[PDB]
Amino acid sequence: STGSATTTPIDSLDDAYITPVQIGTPAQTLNLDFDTGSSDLWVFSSETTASEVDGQTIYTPSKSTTAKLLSGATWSISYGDGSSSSGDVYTDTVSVGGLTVTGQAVESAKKVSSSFTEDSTIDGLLGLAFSTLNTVSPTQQKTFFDNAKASLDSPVFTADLGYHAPGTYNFGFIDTTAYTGSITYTAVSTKQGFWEWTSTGYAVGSGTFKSTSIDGIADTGTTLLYLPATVVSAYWAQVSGAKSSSSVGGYVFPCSATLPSFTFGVGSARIVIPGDYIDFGPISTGSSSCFGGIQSSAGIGINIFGDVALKAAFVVFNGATTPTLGFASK
């Protein structure tokens, strides 16, 4: 089997991407944030504290003839950005782009933190990291991909995120029309539960490539590119007037700037992030200070190849017995 679904930016900055997901019988379609940095499929629901719902579409398990309470199971998750959610668990039929999993754990939120409430466009998350990170207790549950994998034509999924435009998540096949050149594959460590890999270096603009190992995670659920402070300083030094602002929470730059590109290495291959992908717009409405899309990972504890990086590539998440990651230009 295979599946193919379009993923759409939630706003004009590509702050996140939403993908429609069918849950239950008859189908209830929710728009979920596919997150290769976590491993829980959770949704706003009829159980979510009413004051914490503001415009989201909810899953109502009592209206699904295939929903079953997973008795005694609870979940609770906290994300790197400080947001969180928790609740109980149902199993139900879940379909993405025509690919169906029966008995998928659907984690129903009883509580969500303010940032989730405040984002009316995201109805929940669909985790695509390794199932070892799943938070369900006392019986850990499998991700949608883990459940689907054996049925897929090939044990892979691909992320093809757009810059200020829709893109695609495919399951079970590699669309050879969706990228240019060849796909370069690179090793993955699953020891921390992530799609963790090592970039071979970077360049800023038309500058020379610096060969240096940068361990980090391929994370579709993180907006920006978080790299070591040395790398980030080297980038922003090429932008007149850019500075790190403790009050704003990162590097800012004059909105009048033309940003240089940023290149990262995948083995001997190179992925180029155009400068415009690094512009996250005014820090507040009407400001002439703009927020940067490359930020320091210092104090996160891990480097994160988030959407800023991934949207410059066609990315293969290869879930073979020994997982790997592939990157192609597009």
CSV table of C-alpha atoms in Angstrom, one decimal:
chain,number,residue,atom,x,y,z
A,1,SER,CA,0.0,0.0,0.0
A,2,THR,CA,0.9,3.7,-0.2
A,3,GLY,CA,-0.5,7.0,0.8
A,4,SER,CA,-0.1,10.6,-0.4
A,5,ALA,CA,-1.3,13.7,1.3
A,6,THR,CA,-0.8,17.4,0.7
A,7,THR,CA,0.6,19.5,3.6
A,8,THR,CA,-0.2,23.2,3.8
A,9,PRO,CA,1.4,26.1,5.7
A,10,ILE,CA,-0.8,27.4,8.5
A,11,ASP,CA,0.2,31.0,7.8
A,12,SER,CA,2.2,33.3,5.5
A,13,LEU,CA,5.5,32.6,7.4
A,14,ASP,CA,5.3,28.8,7.2
A,15,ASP,CA,5.2,28.6,11.0
A,16,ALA,CA,3.9,25.0,10.7
A,17,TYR,CA,2.3,22.8,8.2
A,18,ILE,CA,-1.1,20.9,8.5
A,19,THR,CA,-2.1,17.7,6.7
A,20,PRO,CA,-5.7,16.3,6.7
A,21,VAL,CA,-6.2,13.0,8.5
A,22,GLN,CA,-9.3,10.9,8.6
A,23,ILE,CA,-10.1,9.4,12.0
A,24,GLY,CA,-13.0,7.1,12.8
A,25,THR,CA,-16.1,5.8,11.1
A,26,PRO,CA,-17.7,7.8,9.5
A,27,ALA,CA,-14.5,9.7,8.9
A,28,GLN,CA,-13.8,12.8,11.0
A,29,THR,CA,-11.2,14.9,9.2
A,30,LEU,CA,-8.7,16.8,11.4
A,31,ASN,CA,-5.8,18.9,10.3
A,32,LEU,CA,-2.7,17.6,12.1
A,33,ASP,CA,0.9,18.8,12.4
A,34,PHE,CA,3.1,15.9,11.2
A,35,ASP,CA,6.0,15.9,13.5
A,36,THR,CA,9.1,13.8,12.9
A,37,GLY,CA,10.5,15.0,16.3
A,38,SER,CA,7.8,13.3,18.4
A,39,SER,CA,5.9,10.0,18.5
A,40,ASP,CA,2.3,10.7,19.8
A,41,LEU,CA,-0.8,11.1,17.6
A,42,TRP,CA,-3.0,13.4,19.7
A,43,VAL,CA,-6.1,15.4,18.9
A,44,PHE,CA,-8.3,18.1,20.2
A,45,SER,CA,-11.5,16.2,21.2
A,46,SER,CA,-14.9,16.3,22.8
A,47,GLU,CA,-13.0,15.6,26.0
A,48,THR,CA,-10.8,18.7,25.8
A,49,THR,CA,-11.4,21.3,28.5
A,50,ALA,CA,-13.9,23.6,26.8
A,51,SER,CA,-12.1,26.9,27.7
A,52,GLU,CA,-8.9,25.4,26.0
A,53,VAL,CA,-10.7,25.0,22.6
A,54,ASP,CA,-10.8,28.0,20.4
A,55,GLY,CA,-11.7,27.2,16.8
A,56,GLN,CA,-10.1,23.8,16.4
A,57,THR,CA,-11.9,20.8,14.8
A,58,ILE,CA,-12.4,18.1,17.4
A,59,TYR,CA,-12.5,14.3,17.4
A,60,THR,CA,-15.6,12.9,19.0
A,61,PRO,CA,-15.0,9.2,19.7
A,62,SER,CA,-18.6,8.6,20.7
A,63,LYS,CA,-19.6,9.3,17.1
A,64,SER,CA,-17.2,6.8,15.7
A,65,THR,CA,-18.4,3.2,15.4
A,66,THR,CA,-14.8,1.9,15.3
A,67,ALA,CA,-13.5,3.9,18.4
A,68,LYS,CA,-12.6,1.9,21.5
A,69,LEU,CA,-11.4,3.3,24.8
A,70,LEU,CA,-7.9,1.9,25.5
A,71,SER,CA,-8.7,1.2,29.1
A,72,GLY,CA,-6.4,2.7,31.7
A,73,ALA,CA,-4.1,4.4,29.2
A,74,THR,CA,-3.1,8.0,29.7
A,75,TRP,CA,-0.6,10.3,28.0
A,76,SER,CA,1.3,13.5,28.7
A,77,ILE,CA,3.8,15.3,26.6
A,78,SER,CA,5.9,18.4,26.7
A,79,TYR,CA,7.6,19.8,23.7
A,80,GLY,CA,10.8,21.7,23.2
A,81,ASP,CA,9.0,25.0,22.8
A,82,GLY,CA,7.5,24.6,26.3
A,83,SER,CA,4.0,23.6,25.1
A,84,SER,CA,2.2,20.5,26.4
A,85,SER,CA,-0.9,18.4,26.3
A,86,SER,CA,-2.3,15.3,28.0
A,87,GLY,CA,-5.3,13.0,28.2
A,88,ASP,CA,-6.6,9.5,27.6
A,89,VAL,CA,-6.5,7.1,24.6
A,90,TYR,CA,-8.7,5.5,22.1
A,91,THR,CA,-8.0,3.1,19.3
A,92,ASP,CA,-9.6,3.9,16.0
A,93,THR,CA,-9.1,3.7,12.2
A,94,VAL,CA,-6.8,6.4,10.9
A,95,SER,CA,-6.2,7.2,7.2
A,96,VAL,CA,-3.7,9.5,5.6
A,97,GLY,CA,-3.8,10.2,1.9
A,98,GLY,CA,-5.5,6.9,1.2
A,99,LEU,CA,-3.3,4.8,3.5
A,100,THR,CA,-5.4,3.2,6.4
A,101,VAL,CA,-4.3,1.9,9.7
A,102,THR,CA,-6.8,0.0,11.9
A,103,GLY,CA,-6.3,0.0,15.7
A,104,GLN,CA,-4.2,3.2,15.7
A,105,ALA,CA,-3.8,4.8,19.2
A,106,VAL,CA,-5.5,8.2,19.0
A,107,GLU,CA,-4.6,10.2,22.1
A,108,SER,CA,-7.5,12.4,23.1
A,109,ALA,CA,-6.5,15.6,24.8
A,110,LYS,CA,-8.2,16.5,28.1
A,111,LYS,CA,-5.8,19.5,28.5
A,112,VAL,CA,-3.7,21.5,26.1
A,113,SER,CA,-1.4,24.5,26.9
A,114,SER,CA,-2.1,28.0,25.8
A,115,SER,CA,0.0,27.9,22.6
A,116,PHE,CA,-2.2,25.0,21.3
A,117,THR,CA,-5.4,26.8,22.2
A,118,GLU,CA,-4.2,30.0,20.5
A,119,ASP,CA,-3.5,28.2,17.2
A,120,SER,CA,-6.9,27.5,15.7
A,121,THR,CA,-5.4,25.9,12.6
A,122,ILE,CA,-3.8,22.9,14.3
A,123,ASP,CA,-6.2,20.2,15.4
A,124,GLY,CA,-3.4,18.0,16.9
A,125,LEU,CA,-0.1,16.3,16.1
A,126,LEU,CA,0.8,13.1,14.3
A,127,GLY,CA,4.2,11.9,15.5
A,128,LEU,CA,6.7,10.3,13.1
A,129,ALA,CA,9.8,9.9,15.3
A,130,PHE,CA,10.5,6.4,16.7
A,131,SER,CA,7.9,4.7,18.8
A,132,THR,CA,10.3,4.5,21.8
A,133,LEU,CA,9.4,8.2,22.5
A,134,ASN,CA,5.6,7.5,22.6
A,135,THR,CA,4.3,8.8,26.0
A,136,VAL,CA,1.3,6.4,26.5
A,137,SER,CA,1.3,4.7,29.9
A,138,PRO,CA,1.3,2.0,31.0
A,139,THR,CA,1.5,0.4,27.6
A,140,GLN,CA,3.5,2.4,25.1
A,141,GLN,CA,1.9,2.8,21.6
A,142,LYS,CA,3.2,2.7,18.1
A,143,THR,CA,3.2,5.6,15.6
A,144,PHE,CA,1.1,5.7,12.5
A,145,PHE,CA,4.2,4.9,10.4
A,146,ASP,CA,5.3,2.1,12.6
A,147,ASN,CA,1.8,0.5,12.4
A,148,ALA,CA,1.6,1.0,8.6
A,149,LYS,CA,5.2,0.0,7.8
A,150,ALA,CA,4.8,-3.7,7.1
A,151,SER,CA,1.9,-3.0,4.7
A,152,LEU,CA,3.7,-0.4,2.7
A,153,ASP,CA,5.3,-1.1,-0.7
A,154,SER,CA,8.6,0.2,0.8
A,155,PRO,CA,9.2,1.0,4.5
A,156,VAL,CA,9.6,4.7,4.0
A,157,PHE,CA,7.9,8.1,4.1
A,158,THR,CA,9.0,11.3,2.5
A,159,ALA,CA,8.6,15.0,3.4
A,160,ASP,CA,8.5,17.5,0.6
A,161,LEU,CA,7.6,20.8,2.4
A,162,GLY,CA,6.9,23.9,0.3
A,163,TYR,CA,8.3,27.4,0.8
A,164,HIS,CA,5.2,29.6,1.2
A,165,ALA,CA,3.3,26.9,-0.7
A,166,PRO,CA,1.8,23.4,-0.2
A,167,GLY,CA,3.9,20.3,-0.3
A,168,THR,CA,3.5,16.6,0.2
A,169,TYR,CA,3.9,13.7,2.6
A,170,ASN,CA,4.1,10.3,0.9
A,171,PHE,CA,4.1,6.9,2.6
A,172,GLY,CA,5.4,3.7,1.0
A,173,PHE,CA,7.1,5.1,-2.1
A,174,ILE,CA,9.6,7.6,-3.4
A,175,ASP,CA,8.2,9.9,-6.1
A,176,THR,CA,11.1,10.2,-8.5
A,177,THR,CA,9.5,13.2,-10.2
A,178,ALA,CA,9.6,15.3,-6.9
A,179,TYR,CA,13.4,16.0,-6.8
A,180,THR,CA,16.3,16.8,-9.0
A,181,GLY,CA,19.6,14.9,-9.2
A,182,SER,CA,20.1,12.0,-6.9
A,183,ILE,CA,19.2,11.3,-3.3
A,184,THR,CA,22.1,11.1,-0.9
A,185,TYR,CA,21.6,8.8,2.1
A,186,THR,CA,23.2,9.2,5.4
A,187,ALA,CA,23.3,7.3,8.7
A,188,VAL,CA,20.8,7.6,11.5
A,189,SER,CA,21.1,7.0,15.2
A,190,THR,CA,17.9,6.1,16.9
A,191,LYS,CA,19.4,6.1,20.4
A,192,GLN,CA,17.5,9.2,21.4
A,193,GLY,CA,14.3,8.2,19.5
A,194,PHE,CA,14.9,10.8,16.8
A,195,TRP,CA,15.9,10.8,13.1
A,196,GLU,CA,19.3,11.9,14.3
A,197,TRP,CA,22.1,12.3,11.7
A,198,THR,CA,25.4,14.1,11.1
A,199,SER,CA,25.7,16.9,8.6
A,200,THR,CA,29.2,17.2,7.0
A,201,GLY,CA,29.4,21.0,7.2
A,202,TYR,CA,28.1,24.3,6.0
A,203,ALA,CA,28.6,27.4,3.9
A,204,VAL,CA,27.2,31.0,4.2
A,205,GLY,CA,26.2,32.6,0.9
A,206,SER,CA,28.8,32.2,-1.8
A,207,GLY,CA,31.5,31.5,0.9
A,208,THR,CA,33.7,28.4,1.1
A,209,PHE,CA,32.4,25.2,2.6
A,210,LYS,CA,33.5,24.5,6.1
A,211,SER,CA,33.8,20.7,6.7
A,212,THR,CA,32.7,20.0,10.2
A,213,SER,CA,30.4,17.4,11.8
A,214,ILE,CA,27.1,18.7,13.0
A,215,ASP,CA,24.9,16.1,14.8
A,216,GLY,CA,21.2,17.0,14.7
A,217,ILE,CA,17.7,15.8,14.1
A,218,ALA,CA,15.4,16.0,11.1
A,219,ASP,CA,12.3,17.6,12.7
A,220,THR,CA,9.3,18.6,10.6
A,221,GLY,CA,7.6,19.9,13.8
A,222,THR,CA,10.1,22.6,14.5
A,223,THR,CA,9.8,25.8,12.4
A,224,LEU,CA,13.4,27.0,12.4
A,225,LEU,CA,17.0,25.8,11.9
A,226,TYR,CA,18.9,25.5,15.2
A,227,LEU,CA,22.6,25.1,15.0
A,228,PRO,CA,25.7,25.6,17.1
A,229,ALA,CA,26.4,29.2,18.2
A,230,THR,CA,29.6,29.4,16.2
A,231,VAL,CA,27.8,28.5,12.9
A,232,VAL,CA,24.9,30.8,13.6
A,233,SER,CA,27.3,33.7,14.4
A,234,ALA,CA,29.1,33.1,11.1
A,235,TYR,CA,25.8,33.3,9.2
A,236,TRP,CA,24.5,36.5,10.8
A,237,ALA,CA,27.9,38.3,10.6
A,238,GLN,CA,27.1,38.5,6.9
A,239,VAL,CA,24.0,40.5,7.4
A,240,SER,CA,24.5,44.2,8.2
A,241,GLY,CA,22.8,45.2,11.4
A,242,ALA,CA,21.9,41.7,12.5
A,243,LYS,CA,22.3,41.0,16.2
A,244,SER,CA,21.3,38.5,18.9
A,245,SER,CA,18.6,40.1,21.0
A,246,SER,CA,18.0,38.6,24.5
A,247,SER,CA,14.7,40.6,24.8
A,248,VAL,CA,13.3,39.1,21.5
A,249,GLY,CA,14.8,35.7,22.1
A,250,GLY,CA,17.2,35.3,19.2
A,251,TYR,CA,18.9,36.8,16.2
A,252,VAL,CA,17.0,39.7,14.5
A,253,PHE,CA,18.0,41.6,11.4
A,254,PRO,CA,16.9,44.7,9.6
A,255,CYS,CA,13.8,44.0,7.5
A,256,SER,CA,15.6,46.0,4.7
A,257,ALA,CA,18.3,43.3,4.4
A,258,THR,CA,18.8,40.8,1.6
A,259,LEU,CA,19.7,37.6,3.4
A,260,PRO,CA,22.4,35.2,2.1
A,261,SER,CA,21.7,31.6,1.5
A,262,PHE,CA,22.9,28.9,3.8
A,263,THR,CA,24.3,25.5,2.6
A,264,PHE,CA,24.4,22.3,4.7
A,265,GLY,CA,26.3,19.1,3.8
A,266,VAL,CA,24.8,15.7,3.5
A,267,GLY,CA,27.8,13.4,2.9
A,268,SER,CA,29.5,14.9,-0.2
A,269,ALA,CA,26.2,16.5,-1.3
A,270,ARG,CA,25.0,20.0,-0.6
A,271,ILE,CA,21.5,21.4,0.2
A,272,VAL,CA,21.1,25.2,-0.4
A,273,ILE,CA,18.6,27.1,1.7
A,274,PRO,CA,17.8,30.3,-0.2
A,275,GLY,CA,18.1,33.5,1.9
A,276,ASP,CA,14.4,34.2,1.7
A,277,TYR,CA,13.6,31.0,3.5
A,278,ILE,CA,15.5,32.5,6.5
A,279,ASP,CA,13.1,35.5,6.8
A,280,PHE,CA,10.5,35.2,9.5
A,281,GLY,CA,9.2,38.7,9.2
A,282,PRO,CA,8.7,41.6,11.7
A,283,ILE,CA,9.2,40.7,15.3
A,284,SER,CA,5.9,42.5,16.1
A,285,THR,CA,3.4,44.0,13.7
A,286,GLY,CA,4.8,47.0,11.9
A,287,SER,CA,8.3,46.6,13.2
A,288,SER,CA,11.4,47.0,10.9
A,289,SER,CA,13.2,44.4,13.0
A,290,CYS,CA,12.8,40.9,11.5
A,291,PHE,CA,13.2,37.5,13.1
A,292,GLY,CA,15.8,35.2,11.8
A,293,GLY,CA,15.2,31.6,10.6
A,294,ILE,CA,18.6,30.3,11.8
A,295,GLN,CA,19.0,30.4,15.5
A,296,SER,CA,21.4,29.0,18.1
A,297,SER,CA,20.8,25.6,19.6
A,298,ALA,CA,22.9,26.5,22.7
A,299,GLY,CA,20.9,25.5,25.7
A,300,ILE,CA,18.5,23.2,23.7
A,301,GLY,CA,21.0,20.4,24.0
A,302,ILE,CA,20.5,19.3,20.4
A,303,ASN,CA,20.8,20.8,16.9
A,304,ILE,CA,17.5,20.8,15.0
A,305,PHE,CA,17.1,20.7,11.2
A,306,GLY,CA,13.6,22.1,11.3
A,307,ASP,CA,11.4,23.3,8.5
A,308,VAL,CA,13.7,26.0,7.3
A,309,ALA,CA,16.2,23.3,6.3
A,310,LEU,CA,13.9,20.5,5.4
A,311,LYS,CA,11.8,22.6,3.0
A,312,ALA,CA,14.9,23.2,0.8
A,313,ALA,CA,15.0,19.4,0.2
A,314,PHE,CA,13.1,16.3,-0.7
A,315,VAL,CA,13.6,14.2,2.4
A,316,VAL,CA,13.4,10.4,2.7
A,317,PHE,CA,12.7,8.9,6.1
A,318,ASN,CA,13.9,5.3,5.5
A,319,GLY,CA,12.4,3.0,8.1
A,320,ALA,CA,14.2,-0.2,7.0
A,321,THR,CA,15.7,-2.5,9.6
A,322,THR,CA,18.6,-0.1,9.9
A,323,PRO,CA,17.0,3.4,9.4
A,324,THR,CA,18.6,6.1,7.2
A,325,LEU,CA,17.8,9.6,5.9
A,326,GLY,CA,18.0,10.7,2.3
A,327,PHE,CA,18.2,14.2,1.0
A,328,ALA,CA,17.8,15.5,-2.5
A,329,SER,CA,17.7,19.0,-4.0
A,330,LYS,CA,14.4,19.9,-5.7
